[PDB]
Amino acid sequence: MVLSEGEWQLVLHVWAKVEADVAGHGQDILIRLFKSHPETLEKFDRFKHLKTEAEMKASEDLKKHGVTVLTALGAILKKKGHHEAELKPLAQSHATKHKIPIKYFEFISEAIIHVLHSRHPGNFGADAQGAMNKALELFRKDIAAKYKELGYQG
């Protein structure tokens, strides 16, 4: 898939707002994911034990990981499709070390869109959401192809 420049522009414009509060967005997104798809919480031995949203909210380790997640994602989006080098070590650890099925990437994609829509509605209208969804689909399709190369797929 190929995004146009206009689409990239919509993505990076909303991402610029996210980067005003990286820690806050990372928390919201991960909490959104664990609530909506409790199965994903299970893959994190580090967080497996958190029982409620408040514990999640109060967890500094969780906030730290959300920063790490969003920094890695931001670096990928800013490459505007040219992200082969950034994707390789990420595919390898998620497929081989952490054992994450491809499906869970769609779940986090959903969470990201939910949170941007909630916090940035003036900069996340229908066209901007379509562009972000395209950017994340591009991402997931490239990660899936790497999974297959690496021996996992799924």
Ligand code: HEM
């Ligand atoms: C937007 C997609 C994602 C990005 C950019 C991302 C990025 C990262 C990064 C940068 C790390 C730390 C270094 C590494 O181990 O590679 C990490 C660790 C990890 N990721 Fe992801 N991740 C994503 C999605 C997911 C999903 C969907 C899951 C599970 C449902 C997941 C589970 C994990 C686990 C289990 C760790 C290790 C945490 C620890 O105990 O330190 N990742 N991720």
